[PDB]
């Protein structure tokens, strides 16, 4: 995973863009204090639970759940944030989209999705709490707003509260990212009126056993072993070790 956190990587943080193109793997790695994590500030809803999703997923393919081109004709998507910089030119997350009002309107949208991928699929989004009512009107053309997300087992109602909050990355507003899983044959409906961060890259998942999440510091080279721990790997047939309790793979 390199520098970005799991929260950063699942959201396509613009610092591990290079992490996009690997979809099959063995076990996550994490620098203990990842800095370039969630670039736009906020509060990942149920962060730990989703962290536990990835502890056992074998492989997963990403796909444009709603392609940026044709999904939002009446809206505009090219919205960046100077905090979430990249090489100095302002940019946003890969997997998310900033549906801001276009041509002076922000028409109501209902961009549903009927899952037919025959596997559990993962979906992300967020609702942007501006720090200031004037921000809200200049960005979404409505005092209040509501967001609804619906499945055959999941539904909840989003009202983005307005409140000035302390400086976080020299930018006062915040989002809450959310997430959910869809069983095969389930349809998810995105009813919204204002303050959305629509999904662009939903993750089609495939679970398993034998993987895990660790937190190491050591570099990586061309070993060949079977039992890796935060302090390295083991290449012996002895049955007990005192290297570190947490293990990966079949281990003594």
């Amino acid at each position, epitope marked *: 995973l390199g520098n970005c956190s799991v929260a950063g990587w699942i959201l396509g943080n613009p610092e591990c863009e290079l992490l996009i193109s690997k979809e099959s793997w063995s076990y996550i790695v994490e620098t203990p204090n990842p800095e370039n994590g969630t670039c736009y500030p906020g509060y990942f809803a149920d962060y730990e639970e989703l962290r536990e999703q990835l502890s056992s997923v074998s492989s997963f393919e990403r796909f444009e759940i709603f392609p940026k081109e044709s999904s939002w004709p009446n809206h505009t998507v090219t*919205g*960046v*944030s*100077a*905090s979430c910089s990249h090489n100095g030119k*302002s940019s946003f997350y890969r997997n998310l989209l*900033w549906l801001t009002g276009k041509n*002076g*309107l922000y028409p109501n949208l209902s961009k549903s999705y009927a899952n037919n991928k025959e596997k559990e699929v993962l979906v992300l989004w967020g609702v942007h709490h501006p720090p*200031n*009512i*004037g*921000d809200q*009107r*200049a*960005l979404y*053309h*409505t*005092e209040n707003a509501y967001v609804s997300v619906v499945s055959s087992h999941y539904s909840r109602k989003f009202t983005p509260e307005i409140a000035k909050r302390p400086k976080v990355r020299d*930018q006062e*507003g915040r989002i809450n990212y959310y997430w959910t899983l869809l069983e095969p044959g389930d349809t998810i409906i995105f009813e919204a009126n204002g303050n959305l961060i629509a999904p662009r890259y939903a993750f089609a998942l495939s679970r398993g056993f034998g993987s895990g999440i660790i937190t190491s510091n050591a570099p990586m080279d061309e070993c060949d072993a079977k039992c890796q721990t935060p302090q390295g790997a083991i290449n012996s047939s002895l049955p007990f070790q005192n290297v570190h309790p947490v293990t990966i793979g079949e281990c003594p």
Partner: antibody, heavy 123, light 109 residues
């Protein structure tokens, strides 16, 4: 293309109340910030105050509690209230659209304008 | 509270030369300043917004620049129809508080 025109010319006696309207062509009053602009002859331009397209008001503090603005609920016209009109503030009165564009999610520096032809409210 | 003191209060030049006008803020307004044009009698049209960009289909004549407190205008090349009065405009974001500056006239010699 939104094109705008004001209404309600004439005079006013001191301490009376000024009320002149402003109706919208081209598009409507649905979206943007709609603004009232006055300019004393041979001087600069102050700003009376303006109201959101939804109908939330913001008035110039230096000239408080003499003004009432809104859209006429036909959402095609809007008017200026001015109670106790002193013979001082004589001006050409401008109806101006103020629309906010942006680049990032921070600098909303874009506060564009398009306005009508000015109303000669001579006292 | 925020005010836009100006200088010079007037500039005169022979049509075809360089021109430069500036406005000074009473505080630190970052970049949300925009300047205008107003021919004798006619209502004004916006020219330069964010003190950075020309308006829609405005000739090569104009350019607004600077950042921070003092912003400056430049006329790389002028035309006699441009003899008019130019302004400046600040718009504080949340409490909208639009306030202009002086506004000066560009006559000739």
């Amino acid at each position: 293309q939104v094109q705008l025109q004001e209404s309600g010319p004439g005079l006013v006696k001191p301490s009376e109340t000024l009320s002149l309207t402003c109706n919208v062509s081209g598009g409507s009053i649905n979206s943007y910030y709609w603004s009232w602009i006055r300019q004393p002859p041979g001087k600069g331009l102050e700003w009376i105050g303006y109201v959101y397209h939804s109908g939330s008001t913001h008035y110039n503090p230096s000239l408080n509690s003499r003004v009432t603005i809104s859209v006429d609920t036909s959402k095609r016209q809007f008017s200026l209230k001015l109670r106790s009109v002193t013979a001082a503030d004589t001006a050409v009165y401008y109806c101006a659209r103020e629309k906010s564009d942006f680049w990032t999610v921070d600098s909303f520096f874009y506060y564009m304008d398009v306005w009508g032809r000015g109303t000669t409210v001579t006292v | 509270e925020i005010v836009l003191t100006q200088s010079p209060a007037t500039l005169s030049l022979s049509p075809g030369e360089r021109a430069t006008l500036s406005c000074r803020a009473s505080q630190s307004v970052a970049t949300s300043l925009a300047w205008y044009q107003q021919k004798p009698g006619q209502p004004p049209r916006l020219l330069i917004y964010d003190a950075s960009h020309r308006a829609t289909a405005i000739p090569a004549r104009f350019t607004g620049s600077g950042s921070g407190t003092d912003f400056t205008l430049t006329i790389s090349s002028l035309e006699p129809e441009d003899f008019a009065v130019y302004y400046c405009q600040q718009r504080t974001h949340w409490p909208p508080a639009l306030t202009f500056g002086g506004g000066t006239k560009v006559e000739i010699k």
